[PDB]
Amino acid sequence: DVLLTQTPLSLPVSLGDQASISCRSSQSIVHSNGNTYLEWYLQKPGQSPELLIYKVSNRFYGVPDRFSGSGSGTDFTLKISRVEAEDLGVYYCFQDSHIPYTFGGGTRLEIKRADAAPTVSIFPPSSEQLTSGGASVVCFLNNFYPKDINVKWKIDGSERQNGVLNSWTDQDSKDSTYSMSSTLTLTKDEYERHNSYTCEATHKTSTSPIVKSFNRNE
Amino acid sequence: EVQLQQSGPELVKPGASVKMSCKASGYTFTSYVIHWVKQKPGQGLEWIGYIYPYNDGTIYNEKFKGKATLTSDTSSSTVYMELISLTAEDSAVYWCVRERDNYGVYWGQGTTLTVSSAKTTPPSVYPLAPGTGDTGSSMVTLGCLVKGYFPEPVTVTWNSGSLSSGVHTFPAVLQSDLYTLSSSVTVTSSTWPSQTITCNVAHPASSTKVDKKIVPE
């Protein structure tokens, strides 16, 4: 097969700045008719891919001129000028000069906005969940940047590491932030043998953690 | 308007087979080939092959010969992909996509295939309301915890979609053959609890819809 190798894997770029990503092929991809059928697609989070560039350098219908493609031989480049928030997602190069058609491995474009601290909210187990014998404490850490963040759970002031499950959203195309959900799950029995439940969020935006807590004894 | 409409999500046991459909409308069905594309987490995008409805001619990625079979039925304007001898490696989102013209490239909405011996399990939907005695003005964040279901997908909306901004629905995570997902919504304090806030959870695999109104604790 024609192998397409994309670099970098991910690329943080601020709004208004230029992004440049490379696609390298394992062989020449000149079709028998003389054309080089290398394409660039953008797949935004949760959507199907959108075609940006075809035949190396031609802009597809409805694609702005700040997307430009170049290359020949085995080296191809997509340049994105004056990046906008809606440009985030995974960019793929693609070839149909040879069967089987193949995709590159993708390059994730990340919008580098100004740092933002999370809004943190803590939630005790629902009464419904307690009737099934389980107990989940949830902390949402919402609309922050950059993505890296650390959540520490404490039960009665002692750090708890077992039973934590964390999940991050994709980058938001409107405000360029991330959000994450942290769920600490215990049995109902163990939950009712303790008083205080705390999630502490440590983030680049401050040297002190953001602390949200509740006491079962209220 | 060109539309490709794919069949719903599927859970199939290893070793069995599945057939997925892609119904085309809004153009001359025999004029364009339809491709199938595999999107497996961690593995980018992969082209499987295409079928030309005009004459049922097919071109396959050699990797999927003996795995995928494409067929076409012009009288119903539908193409199909059948996958046999399924393994966990076949778990993926599968897209159909119509050969482009000058106006666009036309993708179906995708079909999520899970290959597993684990059992379909409906979700438990838990309301997330602030604890008693805390916070105040001027916004309030609520949520729903959707726990213990299998397989994917689950969809979550808030107030039947009327609440769309300020919503964060978090990707599900699989533990011990059951998924857990959560969704938060942030509204002005003047909205809740004065007006109703309800998370709507749908789990097609178990034929389940749950509405959970968020009530103060």
């Binding site: 059928y37 693609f94 149909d96 000069s97 058609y101 | 080939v33 030309y52």
Partner: peptide, 5 residues
Amino acid sequence: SPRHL
């Protein structure tokens, strides 16, 4: 000419 995506 390839049948494009």
